[PDB]
Paper text:
MerTK, a TAM receptor, regulates macrophage efferocytosis and polarization, and its inhibition holds potential for tumor growth suppression and immune modulation. Additionally, MerTK plays a prominent role in regulating efferocytosis, the process by which macrophages engulf and clear apoptotic cells. MerTK is activated upon binding to its ligands, Protein S or growth arrest-specific 6 (GAS6), which recognize phosphatidylserine (PtdSer) exposed on the surface of apoptotic cell debris. In this study, we present a novel strategy for designing MerTK-selective inhibitors by modulating the conformational dynamics of its αC helix.
Since 11 demonstrates highest selectivity with SI of 46.1 among these synthesized inhibitors, the cocrystal structure of MerTK in complex with 11 was resolved to investigate its binding mechanism and molecular basis of the selectivity. The headgroup of 11 orients upward to target the αC helix, while the N,N-dimethylethanamine moiety forms a salt bridge with D678 in the hinge region. This upward binding of 11 contrasts with the previously resolved structures1 and 6which exhibit a downward orientation that extends into the allosteric pocket. Furthermore, the upward positioning of 11 allows the 1-fluorobenzene moiety to form hydrophobic interactions with F634 and A638 on the αC helix and V669 on the β-sheet. Additionally, the para-fluorine of 1-fluorobenzene forms a C–F···O interaction with F634. Moreover, upon the binding to 11, αC helix of MerTK becomes more stable and adopts an outward conformation in both monomers whereas αC helix is more dynamic and adopts two different conformations upon the binding to 1 or 6. The electron density is also clear and more continuous for αC helix, adjacent β3-αC loop and P-loop, indicating 11 stabilizes αC helix and its surrounding areas. However, in the MerTK/11 structure, the introduction of the longer N,N-dimethylethanamine substitution on Ring-6 results in the shift of adjacent DFG motif to accommodate this longer tail. The differential stabilization of the αC helix by 11 in MerTK versus Tyro3 is consistent with their respective inhibitory effects, with IC50 values of 21.5 nM for MerTK and 991.3 nM for Tyro3. These findings suggest that the selectivity of 11 for MerTK over Tyro3 is attributed to its interactions with and stabilization of the αC helix of MerTK.
Residue numbers in the entry:
A (entry chain A): 577 to 659, 665 to 742, 763 to 864
B (entry chain B): 575 to 625, 631 to 659, 664 to 742, 763 to 863
The structure:
Amino acid sequence: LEDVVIDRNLLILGKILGEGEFGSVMEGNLKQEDGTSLKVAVKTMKLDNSSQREIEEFLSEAACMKDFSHPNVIRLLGVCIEMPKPMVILPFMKYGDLHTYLLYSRLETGPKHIPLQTLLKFMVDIALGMEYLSNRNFLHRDLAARNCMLRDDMTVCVADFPVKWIAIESLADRVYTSKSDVWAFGVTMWEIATRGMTPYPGVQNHEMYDYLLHGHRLKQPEDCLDELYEIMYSCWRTDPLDRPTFSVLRLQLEKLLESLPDV
Amino acid sequence: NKLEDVVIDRNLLILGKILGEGEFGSVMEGNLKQEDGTSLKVAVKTMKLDNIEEFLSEAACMKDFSHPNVIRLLGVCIEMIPKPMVILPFMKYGDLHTYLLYSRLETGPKHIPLQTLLKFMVDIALGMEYLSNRNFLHRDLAARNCMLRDDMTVCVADFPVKWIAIESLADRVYTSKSDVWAFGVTMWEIATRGMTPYPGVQNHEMYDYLLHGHRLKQPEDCLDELYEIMYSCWRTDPLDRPTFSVLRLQLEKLLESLPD
Ligand SMILES: CN(C)Cc1cccc(-c2c(-c3cnn(C)c3)oc3ncnc(Oc4ccc(NC(=O)c5cn(C)n(-c6ccc(F)cc6)c5=O)cc4)c23)c1
Ligand SMILES: CN(C)Cc1cccc(-c2c(-c3cnn(C)c3)oc3ncnc(Oc4ccc(NC(=O)c5cn(C)n(-c6ccc(F)cc6)c5=O)cc4)c23)c1
C-alpha cells in the first residue's frame, strides 16, 4: 500500500461541503507534483478502529481505485493519514451532484430546462462508468443520482459517497451482485427521467419489500419515451440473471440517444 | 357541556386498515353509522396524550366550523385507559402533495394544467381566509396537510422547518402572517408539483439562509405574477405580508385573467 498516500503538509482543508455521521466532506487545495495547487474535495472517513478490517479494506479499495482510469468514473487522487483519521482526496467539481442539479434545472434562475437528449446522455455517461466498473468486477452498492458527480465539461462520473434503490433480491437475502447495481441504475435512470422525484411516490420505506414482491415497479414518467422506460424496466426484472448487463444497457441507451435529433 | 354534542358513541364506528401512521397518531379507514341509518366512509385519527380536556375542546370549536374548503369534524370517540380518536370524512383522492407527485406519472392522474393548479391554491386560500377570519392558527400548513375532496376541490386539514416563517424560527411567535408564509411555500409546492422546498439547502442551513434575504426560487414555467403573489408571502416583516383574504382575491384575478 501507500502508493496512494499524500503527505499531509500538501493538503489545505477548507470548509465542510457536507457533514454525515461516519464522515464529512470538505473542500481543499492539493499541492501537486508540478508546483500547482488543484482544487480537491476531501472525505474524512471514520472507520471501526477496534480492528483493522475497515482500515485494511480502506487502503486496499483505494489501492486499486488509484489504478482506475475512466472519464465517467471519478478519479482517486490519493489518501492522507492524520493523527488517527483517513481521508480520501478527489478532484473538486463546482457543479456538484447530478441529483441537486436536476432539481436546480426546475428553477427559472437555475440551469436551463434539460432537454430529453441531455438526460439520455446523463444516463449514457453513468452506464459507461458502470460498464467499466463491472467489467473489472467492481461492485458499487450505492448507485443513486445523489452519488453521480458533474465534471466541469458537464459529463457525469460515477462516485460513492437507501432501501428504495436496493434490489428485491438484496432486501430479503443479504446479497449483492452486479445485477444489484443494475437495479439501482434503473432507479437512477428513473430519478433522472423525473428530474429528481423521490422514487416510489406514495410508498413508504418499510413497505418496499411487500410492494416489490407483489410485483410492482417504478412507474413510467409523464412524458418518458416508451423505449426509455422499457430499458429501465429491464433493470428491475425479478431474477438478477434476466436483467441486462451494463455493457448491454450502455449500447441500448447509445442507440436510443442517436435515434433522437440534436438538443 | 357540548362535549357530548361532539362525541360519537364508540359502538357506531368500525375501524379498518391504516391509511397512514405517525408516532403521535395513526389514521385508519372506518365505517360510521349515521343518524339516518346509512354508513359513511370516514377517516379515524387516533391521538395519544400523556395523562385531554383541551383536546375535547378543540374538536368542540373545530366542529362548529363549516367551510367547503375546510375539512369537517364528524365527531369524537373515546375508547378504553383513554384512547381518543378523531373522525373525519374519508376522501379517496388523498393528500394534495402525493396527488401532485402522481400527476407526473403516466399511470397516475393526467398532467395538471396551470389553471387547475391555480384552483388548488384558490381553494386553500378560501379555507385559510375562513379560518384566519375566525382567528384560528393552522400552524402546520403544507401541501401534505391539504386533502382532495371527491369533487376535486381542496380542503384544509391538520395532520417541517422549511414551512416555518423566519420570525417564527427566531422566537416561538406565531401569527396568521406566519401561516401566510407557509401558504407561500404551499403555493410553491403546487407550482413545482411536489418538489421539496429549497433544493440543495439543508434543514439546519435554513434560518441562516433565510436571514440573509434568500427566498424560494421561481419555478421554471411559472407565471411572473403567480410568483409575485407567493413572494409577498415571504416578506421579512409579517406586517408587510398580505392577508389570506387579499391573497384569495389576487389568485382569483390571475385565474380569471387566464384563458380557459
Ligand atoms: C449533495 N451535495 C449538496 C452535498 C455534498 C456533500 C459532500 C460533497 C459534495 C461535493 C461537491 C459540492 C458541494 N457543493 N457544490 C456546489 C459542490 O463537490 C464535490 N466534488 C467532489 N466530491 C464531492 O463529494 C464527494 C466526496 C467523496 C467521494 N468519494 C468517492 O467517490 C469514493 C469512491 N471510493 C471507492 N471511495 C473510497 C472508499 C473507501 C476507501 F477506503 C477509499 C476510497 C470514495 O471515497 C465522492 C464525492 C463533492 C456535496
Ligand atoms: C400519503 N398518504 C398516505 C398520507 C395520508 C396519511 C394518513 C391518512 C391519509 C388519508 C387518506 C388516504 C387516501 N389514500 N391513502 C393511502 C390515504 O384519506 C383521508 N381522508 C381523510 N383524512 C385523512 O387523513 C387525515 C387524518 C386526520 C386529519 N385531522 C384533521 O384534519 C384535524 C383538524 N383538527 C383541528 N384536528 C384536531 C386536532 C387536535 C384535537 F384535539 C382535535 C382535532 C384534527 O385532527 C386530517 C387528515 C386521509 C393520507
